[PDB]
Amino acid sequence: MANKPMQPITSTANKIVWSDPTRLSTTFSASLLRQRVKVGIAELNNVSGQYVSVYKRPAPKPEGCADACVIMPNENQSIRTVISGSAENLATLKAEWETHKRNVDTLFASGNAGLGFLDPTAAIVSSDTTA
Amino acid sequence: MANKPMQPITSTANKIVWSDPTRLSTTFSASLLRQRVKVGIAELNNVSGQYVSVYKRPAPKPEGCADACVIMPNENQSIRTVISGSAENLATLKAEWETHKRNVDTLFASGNAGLGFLDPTAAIVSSDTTA
């Protein structure tokens, strides 16, 4: 009852879907997506990575008749993240890791998604650049 | 020389692109993308959020002739993340925040993007569910 590890449900490749029985109830897979190598004449390997996960949580009560009176609520969420780029990606990733977490952390603390809008004081900061 | 804050270049709406002069020199445009309501008969507000980023860092020094001579390299990265879902999203996000960080943190520590492939020991864990 501490960690919430997920397990696959029939799959064997670079695109395997994972899910839990009663942990998160989520289900999805994550694979790499190499493409869009714009601006890259000089020899430079191309790296990328895509990960998507869905979260579903329907009402507890059972089903019934949906005609006169029926109330069967359900939750539906989806998260998609993709990152691609030349070899330099391995470097931008480390910086983007703490940057994508801070930029989104400050946007939720200053802005409000409940209205699909943000404030003019969107002061976002990045991890770093060098020492 | 501590924080790397970003600023807009020219915009005024829910979709504005920010960047820095020398800090990161990368363009980032955030915008709310509401869609795909899916199973959601019961009254439940719809929330979402999409964020796009574009990293660019070309080799130093000026340009020259690109025919019988050698050209300078250039780095190019891109990060796209989007999340949508009913009101439950507000709660799911909190959990997905630490989950998307650990799931991706363990995938990079166990797997290798350099080969666009991962290992069979992809033991990913989620934040939590309840107490």
mmCIF file of N, CA and C in Angstrom, chain B residues 12 19 34-35 38 46 49 71 112 121 123:
data_model
loop_
_atom_site.group_PDB
_atom_site.id
_atom_site.type_symbol
_atom_site.label_atom_id
_atom_site.label_comp_id
_atom_site.label_asym_id
_atom_site.label_seq_id
_atom_site.Cartn_x
_atom_site.Cartn_y
_atom_site.Cartn_z
ATOM 1 N N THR B 12 -0.742 38.839 -27.194
ATOM 2 C CA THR B 12 -1.651 39.202 -26.114
ATOM 3 C C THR B 12 -2.930 38.375 -26.173
ATOM 4 N N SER B 19 10.351 33.720 -24.804
ATOM 5 C CA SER B 19 11.721 33.334 -25.121
ATOM 6 C C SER B 19 12.720 34.257 -24.429
ATOM 7 N N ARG B 34 -9.262 22.429 -25.131
ATOM 8 C CA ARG B 34 -10.400 21.692 -24.599
ATOM 9 C C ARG B 34 -11.120 20.927 -25.706
ATOM 10 N N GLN B 35 -11.217 19.612 -25.544
ATOM 11 C CA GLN B 35 -11.880 18.767 -26.531
ATOM 12 C C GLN B 35 -11.949 17.321 -26.050
ATOM 13 N N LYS B 38 -15.714 12.748 -24.328
ATOM 14 C CA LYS B 38 -15.948 11.325 -24.114
ATOM 15 C C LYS B 38 -17.022 11.103 -23.054
ATOM 16 N N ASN B 46 -15.267 20.658 -17.923
ATOM 17 C CA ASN B 46 -14.164 20.102 -18.699
ATOM 18 C C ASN B 46 -12.934 21.001 -18.616
ATOM 19 N N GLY B 49 -5.171 21.501 -20.857
ATOM 20 C CA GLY B 49 -4.017 22.380 -20.928
ATOM 21 C C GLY B 49 -2.935 21.841 -21.843
ATOM 22 N N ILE B 71 30.303 22.746 -43.167
ATOM 23 C CA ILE B 71 29.349 23.627 -42.502
ATOM 24 C C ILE B 71 29.351 23.400 -40.994
ATOM 25 N N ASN B 112 17.036 3.388 -22.489
ATOM 26 C CA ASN B 112 17.959 4.245 -23.225
ATOM 27 C C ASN B 112 17.307 4.781 -24.497
ATOM 28 N N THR B 121 12.586 -4.547 -18.084
ATOM 29 C CA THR B 121 12.451 -4.249 -16.664
ATOM 30 C C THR B 121 11.903 -2.842 -16.448
ATOM 31 N N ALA B 123 9.882 -1.058 -14.793
ATOM 32 C CA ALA B 123 9.053 -0.999 -13.596
ATOM 33 C C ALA B 123 8.696 0.443 -13.247
#
